[PDB]
Design a protein that fits this description.
Chain lengths: 852, 854
């Protein structure tokens, strides 16, 4: 059938708020069983004082889960915690939960108690109906399917202690047979009602010392514990991270026993173990370690270990390692299987078997312990290699056993782009949630698989995760940037700049990105017939290279096209487009009116037709007065050419009168600065003589002009004329008319809506200040390249980071070569890095809420 | 070959106002509303609750000792579990399967359950609560306790998906059987209403109808009525089934996922996709459906969501209306067990050929176009079942949906056959005499239903320690009624006694010739003697009273009949623990022991007679004499001797005709019983036989070429005990048989070794030895005759003997005597589960409404 892997995990265990703390406690030999009065007075009714308790049951990020406060207070704490642990298990696997919505993903939850339901229905006069929706057993599974939008089976099951490993088994069968592509498996247990512990006490199942002395002579019962664990299983193809592959999972039941229903049968357990390795085609000698059910009972331990010995140790030359998580944290009953699984996977990820606590003298009823066929892990031991088995046996006789093949994927071989900086983006319910992801990303900045997975889980809408951040890794000038995301819809606008943005060496830093390089090489092919190569112009060390009009027009357009291609590969589509002068050629590419070759040829012919003609000497100057003021003050022959902002306009005309006016104006104290245009009066009647030959060349280039969309605001045609036949398409005529007409830039900027995110598409963000002045103050202005910057690749990635802060989604993973999956063993855990808004404290039943 | 074919093989249940499925059906087809308004569980109207709810008649009954539960544990067991254990046993036997045959198998158990109210009531007092209440009330035990008792080793799981739980259990068990993981499975659904607080929760959620009625599909639908239910179904792969109610063509589940309307808003679009995906994957056409059992809880929002989803899934291209019904309208909504309750209603409708109608349907919900246009037709009147697939929906309030497709079993009744006129034996076992009486009475009422009787006979082999009462009835016979008795405790060794001379009678065996196995045995014996101008079957048909006066005829015919009787006993698996033969009866003993083949035994009887005849000895005689053996010896005139030691005070003498006759006459004069035997005028077991020895030995050496050892089960009557370990007594050789003819019959001597409490069968065409056996055996022995001289119908007499064998605690299935019934049983074969009775005299604890917080 289908290969089944464990793709992600999370959990809350005794004295452990997450799996990292669980591991620290395990490998540190910390006893997680405690003796405080968290749940009820110590020794109440003669109960043992010790039990494994979660640090907190009151926390729940209710609004992220769409739960109203009234329902949150009346929801079983097991469910409140399982909703968050489930989310963490999914992202732990590097999967964005949104990608599983509407799928036939299944949910199986192992659960045996409904104490909250009892507490909440105790008063008929005051009880509320919605406590049934938050506490009824089926909801422990159904509420997950509801929130995550999972449509596969949704089942809560009870086989007592083996519940959660039985959920794992049923989930494995559903994936193996092709019924589900993925599944959530959960295990939950809380200790709210002291009466329940009294019942177990009187059955003789509880140790008076509240300890699971697994495999030890002194074993006399188990210590009750709490636990909330979730695991994400998927078919191999869907996994990003793989902790292990499930080779087989199976169940049987003891059936009739002369000793009674609660007497465990080692003979039946042994048959289960054997039938599973036989049917998986696995040899008993291939096992390195077995996680025994190991509750530390006088009858159960020998039954189980002697069954393991007969099933697995008959022909083994080496001892078989054996451990029990229950010796470290107590017995979380139905959640026991998944807690033991978490200890196993964490041991494998760290290369060390965590050891048992409380093992001093071998149970004398167990020969393999005295003879070395079984070896208890009572010291941390390196993981050497081999399959792992896990047992979970219920007190009613339901047995489950699973065989795992650990993922041993080695770290990747050093690669070229690994040296390039990378962008890491993060989202979170709070600033601390974001900070936590960026900090760990920084700490593992060379772990490409880890960063790739983090980048994949960050695309969560700002309405759900209001804080965002980024960090450019492997660069020079970087540190984490975090901010709350301004609420509302934020339209994305592209501004393509015109002349004055070229500089020696421009684009060379971005050439290290394959997509940008490939775009440039494609532009080279367009101009090859004209003896030009864009990549060679960019490599030129001659400061005068871009003084040549054709070099600068072609190189500018090529770079703009390369930047638009980087943005497109991340799925960005602008809501608005504005070009300045020659920038309209790249706007036509961005709007989808011009192909890459047409845009590049259009910039070539525009410059070449200028080169092939003679024009009288012209000049342009930035004047410190309004458009209206300019039209009245301009001397004869001089005209307003660019309406950049309210108080800054560019004039164009005959060289002398221009230099004169600049003089006159400076006389009257007005700002006047001659621009350098190489003796050209662009955007004036002066260009008129270029029109005819340019129109002839462009008609051959743009054979089938396409209509400009409403996103694209023309700067060469006044708004009053937007319905004209000339403004309809990006035709040879449209492009010729741009050259001889004024740039109505400020006019277009006025139509940019509030809260827009504006990117400057240019080799140097020349228009930043003009943009700030002409745009509504609620706009975010982002530059993508800077003249002479040490490393424009880093500057560009910071801008993509700023895009993320603004609430726009752009995954930087797409800019770099795809990481190979599954991730290497040891890729850092993600679930413990997830933080929620846990400021509120929700109702939790008290010991007195139950009958006494 | 997608996988294994899955069938519903048996069912049982306890539903509102219905102690079993027969009462459930009577209520359904009779239009009886099973929802009531009494104070059984709590003061009606308490907390403003609706007064009406579906309640089981009793929650206190449980045959604790059958299930090995001590009284202290029975009082602290959830009533759901106590009831489920019995309903599970009834579901298995309902299928005509003896539960013992599933012990140790990988049979699975899935139980749909949503409440543990008893567990709450029983753990309320920390000072007094006991630990074993956890073993009888924890949710996992609802499944685990069944696996434990029945010895099932497949998966054992309790599951909760709210309303759809029990149909989800059925889907999971269908998948485990279909994929080859389990050969069979028990599927259960349970719900009880003990805690009024629970109903308050639902009331406040707006889910309960103030009228306590599920007005399914009706404009007045405003919520559901809560009910109780305990249902169990046995699923098996096709090959294991005897009865088949229906084949499951497909079963599947999906979940609503996220809904803008909230978690409890039912999604018709998702339900519709489940229905479509299932008939598409089963290769079933939507037009092939006759009827659909809708979840139909009678809610304002749910009904149209469901029925409009059904319309889009199934009614797009249908030319005929699709029938729809809802069992909830009849008995309310038993929550997790609703899927199995609906299933019971469907299967009972199919078995009776009538769709049981809904109650409370007056005006169609106006938001459902197909009810207004006739594309969907509510069954509000009983309608005949016409043919086609059936679908069943069960949707949980949390969004878990289950749908199943069934193909009804339409197997017609069997074609009239010749053997169907023969009488049949019905055996029964039970916890009480009333349980046995109930099976025999129903068997009598359906005496021509072969499949029904065959299935009843298959469930009767239960040890006496578990079912202390047994009974039988010979059906289709002239006379005879039920025999019921408590089964005497202890091991009871089975002994075969093969009689000798004096048992022959004109027409013997003719009645048994109607049984194919007996007839076939006789025809085989005919072949052995055909070369000698004899045909056993023709001697049995002879109307000549002198036929058996010829010793060859009588020897051969007796042996053949005893062999035929041994063959009938062997086909039922009976193996004797002891064997004693009388005179020529020792030949059949050899066959029964295993040392003589049928042909050897028949040829041995032939030669014994023919060699005697061939010698033309002087006239001899034998006579049954009412004297002890010793008392006989001293009154035995010269030439006359004691030949057969039958009992303490009765012996057979043998000698010269003249002196035996004269001695017989003087005996009658002196008031003694003197009865001359029919011996072809010969003196058997006497010196007069000595001249026959040599030629007989020569013929027998050719017949018995390779003697075989005589088991220790076989006590010799021709060789004194002191010599039982000699070489002659070792094998059934030519010498052993020659010696039998020439030596006395030490019958009484052998009888002394028969142990106490033995069950003794007389293998003979006429049970001549009954009184001798009574006298010579310990008084604790049961003596059973198999044939009687001149009986009107020895087939009936033989079956009544097989019945007596059952009563004694020995197992012998009479089904093996008759042609095998073809399985699956015909549709309509009477239900068995309702016929099962238990020892329900005690009343066990049930929590009271006041045992919960108020
Ligand atoms: Cl035999």
């Amino acid at each position: 059938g289908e290969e089944v892997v464990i793709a992600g995990m999370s959990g809350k265990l005794p004295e452990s708020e997450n799996l990292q703390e669980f591991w620290d406690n395990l490998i540190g030999g910390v006893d997680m069983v405690t003796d405080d009065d968290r749940r009820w007075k110590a020794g109440l009714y003669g109960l043992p004082r010790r039990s494994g308790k979660l640090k907190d049951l009151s926390r729940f990020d209710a609004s992220f889960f769409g739960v109203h406060p009234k329902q949150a207070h009346t929801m079983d704490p097991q469910l409140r915690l399982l909703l968050e642990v489930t989310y963490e298990a999914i992202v732990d696997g590097g999967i964005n939960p949104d990608s599983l919505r509407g799928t036939h993903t299944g949910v199986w939850v192992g659960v045996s108690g409904s104490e909250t339901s009892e507490a909440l229905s105790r008063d008929p006069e005051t009880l509320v109906g919605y406590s049934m929706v938050g506490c009824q057993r089926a909801m422990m599974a159904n509420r997950l399917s509801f929130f995550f939008d999972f449509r596969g089976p949704s089942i809560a099951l009870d086989t007592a202690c083996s519940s959660s490993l039985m959920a794992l088994q049923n989930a494995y069968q559903a994936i193996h047979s092709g019924q589900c592509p993925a599944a959530i498996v959960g295990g939950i247990n809380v200790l709210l009602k002291p009466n329940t512990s009294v019942q177990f006490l009187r059955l003789g199942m509880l140790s008076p010392e509240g300890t699971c002395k697994a495999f030890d002579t002194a074993g006399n019962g188990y210590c009750r514990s709490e636990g909330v664990v979730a695991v994400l299983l998927t078919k191999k193809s869907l996994a990003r991270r793989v902790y292990a592959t499930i080779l087989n999972a199976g169940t049987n039941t003891d059936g009739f026993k002369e000793q009674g229903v609660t007497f465990p049968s080692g003979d039946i357990q042994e048959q289960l173990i054997r039938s599973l390795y036989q049917s998986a085609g696995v040899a008993p000698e291939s096992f390195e370690y077995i996680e025994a059910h190991g509750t530390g009972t006088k009858v159960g331990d020998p039954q189980e270990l002697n069954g393991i010995t007969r099933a697995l140790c008959a022909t083994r030359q080496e001892p078989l390692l054996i451990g029990s998580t229950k010796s470290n944290m107590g017995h979380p009953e139905p959640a026991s299987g998944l807690a033991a699984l978490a200890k196993v996977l964490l041991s494998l990820e760290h290369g060390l078997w965590a050891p048992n606590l409380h093992f001093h003298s071998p149970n004398p009823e167990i020969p393999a312990l005295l003879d070395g066929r079984l070896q208890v892990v009572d010291q941390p031991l390196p993981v050497r290699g081999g399959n792992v088995g896990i047992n979970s046996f219920g007190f009613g006789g339901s047995n489950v056993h699973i065989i795992l093949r650990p993922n041993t994927q080695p770290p990747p071989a050093p690669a070229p782009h690994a040296t390039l900086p990378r962008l890491l983006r993060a989202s979170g319910r709070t600033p601390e949630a974001v900070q936590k992801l960026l900090e760990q990303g920084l700490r593992h900045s060379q772990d490409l698989a880890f960063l790739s997975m983090l980048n994949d889980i960050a695309a969560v809408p700002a309405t759900a995760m209001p804080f965002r951040g980024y960090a450019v890794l492997g660069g020079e000038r970087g540190g984490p940037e975090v901010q709350q995301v301004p609420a509302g819809e934020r339209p994305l606008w592209f501004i393509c700049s015109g002349m004055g943005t070229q500089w020696r060496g421009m684009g060379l830093s971005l050439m290290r990105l394959d997509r940008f390089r490939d775009s440039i090489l494609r532009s080279d092919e367009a101009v090859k017939p004209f003896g030009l190569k864009v990549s060679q112009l960019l490599l030129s060390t001659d400061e005068s290279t871009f003084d040549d009009i054709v070099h600068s027009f072609v190189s500018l357009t090529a770079i703009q096209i390369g930047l638009i291609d980087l943005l497109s590969c991340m799925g960005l589509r602008p809501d608005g487009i504005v070009g300045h002068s020659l920038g309209e050629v790249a706007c036509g590419y961005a709007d989808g009116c011009l192909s890459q070759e047409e845009a590049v040829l259009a910039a070539y012919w525009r410059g070449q037709c200028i080169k092939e003609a003679h024009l009288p000497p012209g000049a342009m100057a930035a004047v410190g007065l309004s458009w209206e003021e300019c039209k009245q003050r301009c001397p004869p022959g001089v005209v307003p050419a660019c309406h950049n902002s309210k108080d800054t306009v560019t004039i164009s005309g005959p060289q002398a009168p221009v230099f004169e006016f600049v003089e006159q104006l400076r006389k009257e104290g007005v700002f006047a600065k001659e621009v350098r245009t190489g003796g050209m009066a662009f955007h004036s009647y002066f260009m008129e003589a270029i029109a005819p030959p340019l129109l002839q060349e462009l008609k051959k280039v743009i054979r089938e002009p396409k209509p400009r969309s409403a996103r694209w605001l023309s700067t060469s045609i006044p708004e009053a004329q937007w319905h004209s036949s000339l403004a309809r398409t990006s035709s040879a005529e449209y492009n010729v008319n741009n050259l001889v007409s004024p740039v109505l830039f400020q006019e277009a900027l006025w139509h940019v809506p509030e809260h827009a995110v504006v990117l400057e598409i240019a080799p140097h963000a020349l228009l930043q200040a003009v943009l700030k002045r002409g745009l509504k103050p609620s706009c975010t202005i982002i530059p993508l390249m800077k003249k002479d910057h040490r490393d424009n690749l880093e500057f560009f990635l910071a801008g993509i980071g700023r895009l993320h802060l603004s609430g726009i989604d752009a995954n930087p993973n797409a800019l770099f070569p795809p990481v190979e999956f599954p991730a290497p063993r040891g890729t850092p855990l993600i679930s413990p890095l997830i933080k929620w808004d846990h400021s509120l404290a929700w109702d939790v039943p008290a010991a007195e809420d139950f009958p006494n």
